[PDB]
Design a protein around this ligand. Structure first.
Ligand SMILES: [Ca+2]
Ligand SMILES: [Ca+2]
Ligand SMILES: [Ca+2]
Ligand SMILES: [Ca+2]
Length: 402
C-alpha cells in the first residue's frame, strides 16, 4: 500500500514492537476454577539473560484448597508484583534473600471476608522447603522469613542445603505465598488464598522456559503451628545442559534496583502518612500531612492525586502502590528538580539554608518525634562545611539513598 517505503518499514516495526509490548503482561491474572473449587493463573516472567537477551517463563498455575472449608471464589482480578533479590553478605551458602510486594487489583468497586484472613493481620513467620530434581540434578532449598499481609510484604531467606544450586535463583522465585498479597478492603472477598487458610491450598505449576525445559511444581501452602509453610516438590525436564538455566546464563537482579534498606525507608515514610497504621493511605490521611506541611488541597484534589497512583482505583493507596510511585525512575533532571523542591519544603524561610528548627518543623508536621539533640545531631550529620546549617549541596549529598 501507500506510503514511503520508509514509512512502511517503520509502521510494520512499530506494530511488531507494539505486539511485544502488549504481550508483556506484567500483572498476574487470577480467574476462578469453581469446578475445582479453586483458582488458576497463566502468566509469564521475563528473566534477563546475561547477554542482553531474555528468558521468558510461561507459567501455568492451578490452586486448590487442601481442606474442605468454604473458601472464597473470586472474580477476575489480578495480583501485582514487585520482587527484590539480594544477598546476605553474612551467609556463606548458595542462597537468595527475596523480598516481594504483592498487591491485588482488577475490580472497580455488613462486609465479611474470611475467617482465615485474620491470621495475616500481623506478622507471620514463614518456612519454605523445596525439593527438586532438574534433569536428574537433585537439590533442596530451605528458608525462613515473614509475611506481613497489610503491607503486602514477604521477606524470605532461602538456602540451598545440598550445596550449589543447579539452576539460577530467579527461576525459583515464583515457586518459593500469595496469601501475603494485600487485598484491598473493597475486594477482600476475592482473596481465595487467605480464605483457604488455616488448612491451606495446593499450588501447582508448570513453567515452560522457551526453547528450554519445563518445571513442574506442586506445593502445599498451609499453617503449621502458626508458621505459614510453603513446601514444594519441583521436577524439571527437557533442559539443555547449557541453556540459560542449566548453564546459569541467567542474571540475578537488575542493577538500578532498590536495596532492602531503601524499601525499609519507604515503609517508614509510608507510616508517616498511615496515621492509623492500617496499611493504606486515605484522602483524609494525605490531607492531614499536606495541611500540616501548610497546603490546602481540596477533598477532590486529594482524590485525584491518589487516583493517579491508586492502581485498583479504590481511592486509597497501599504500600506497594506507594512503593511503586517511589520506584519510578525519572529523567534525572526531573529527579534533580524533585530534590530542589524537597529542599524548598525543608528550607521554609527559603533563605537557602536548612536550620535546626526548620528541620524540626518538617519532621514534626510529618508526624515524627524528635529530641533537640537528634535534630542537632542530624544537622551535624549533614552540615559538612560545618556552618551549623544545611545548604542545597549538603542536602543533595545527604539525600542520596534515593
Ligand atoms: Ca490508614
Ligand atoms: Ca489502592
Ligand atoms: Ca532557611
Ligand atoms: Ca553547612
Amino acid at each position: 500500500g501507500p506510503g514511503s517505503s520508509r514509512r512502511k518499514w517503520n509502521k510494520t516495526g512499530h506494530a511488531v514492537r507494539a505486539i511485544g509490548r502488549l504481550s508483556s503482561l506484567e500483572n498476574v491474572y487470577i480467574m476462578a476454577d469453581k469446578q475445582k473449587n479453586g483458582i488458576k493463573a497463566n502468566f509469564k516472567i521475563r528473566h534477563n539473560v546475561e547477554d542482553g537477551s531474555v528468558q521468558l517463563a510461561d507459567h501455568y498455575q492451578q490452586n486448590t484448597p487442601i481442606g474442605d472449608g468454604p473458601v472464597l471464589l473470586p472474580d477476575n482480578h489480578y495480583l501485582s508484583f514487585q520482587s527484590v533479590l539480594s544477598k546476605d553478605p553474612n551467609e556463606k551458602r548458595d542462597h537468595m534473600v527475596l523480598l516481594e510486594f504483592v498487591t491485588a487489583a482488577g475490580i472497580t468497586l455488613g462486609g465479611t471476608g474470611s475467617k482465615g484472613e485474620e491470621l495475616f493481620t500481623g506478622v507471620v513467620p514463614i518456612l519454605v522447603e523445596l525439593d527438586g530434581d532438574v534433569n536428574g540434578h537433585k537439590f533442596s532449598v530451605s528458608g525462613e522469613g515473614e509475611g506481613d499481609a497489610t503491607y503486602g510484604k514477604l521477606t524470605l531467606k532461602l538456602i540451598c542445603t545440598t550445596g550449589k544450586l543447579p539452576v539460577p535463583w530467579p527461576t525459583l522465585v515464583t515457586t518459593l505465598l500469595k496469601c501475603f498479597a494485600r487485598y484491598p478492603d473493597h475486594m477482600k472477598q476475592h482473596d481465595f488464598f487467605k480464605s483457604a487458610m488455616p488448612e491451606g491450598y495446593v499450588q501447582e505449576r508448570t513453567i515452560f522456559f522457551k526453547d528450554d525445559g519445563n518445571y513442574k511444581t506442586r506445593a502445599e501452602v498451609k499453617f503449621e503451628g502458626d508458621t505459614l509453610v510453603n513446601r514444594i516438590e519441583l521436577k524439571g525436564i527437557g533442559f539443555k545442559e547449557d541453556g540459560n538455566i542449566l548453564g546459569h546464563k541467567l542474571e540475578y537482579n537488575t542493577r538500578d534496583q532498590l536495596t532492602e534498606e531503601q524499601i525499609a525507608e519507604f515503609k517508614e515514610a509510608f507510616s508517616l502518612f498511615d496515621k492509623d497504621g492500617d496499611g493504606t493511605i486515605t484522602t483524609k490521611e494525605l490531607g492531614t500531612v499536606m495541611r500540616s506541611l501548610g497546603q490546602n488541597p481540596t477533598e477532590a484534589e486529594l482524590q485525584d492525586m491518589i487516583n493517579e497512583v491508586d492502581a485498583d482505583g479504590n481511592g486509597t493507596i497501599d504500600f506497594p502502590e506507594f512503593l511503586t510511585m517511589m520506584a519510578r525512575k525519572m529523567k534525572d533532571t526531573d529527579s534533580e528538580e524533585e530534590i530542589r523542591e524537597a529542599f524548598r519544603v525543608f528550607d521554609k524561610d527559603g533563605n537557602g539554608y536548612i536550620s535546626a528548627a526548620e528541620l524540626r518543623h518538617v519532621m514534626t508536621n510529618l508526624g515524627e518525634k524528635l529530641t533537640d539533640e537528634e535534630v542537632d545531631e542530624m544537622i551535624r550529620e549533614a552540615d559538612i562545611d560545618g556552618d551549623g546549617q544545611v545548604n542545597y549541596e549538603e542536602f543533595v549529598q545527604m539525600m542520596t539513598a534515593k
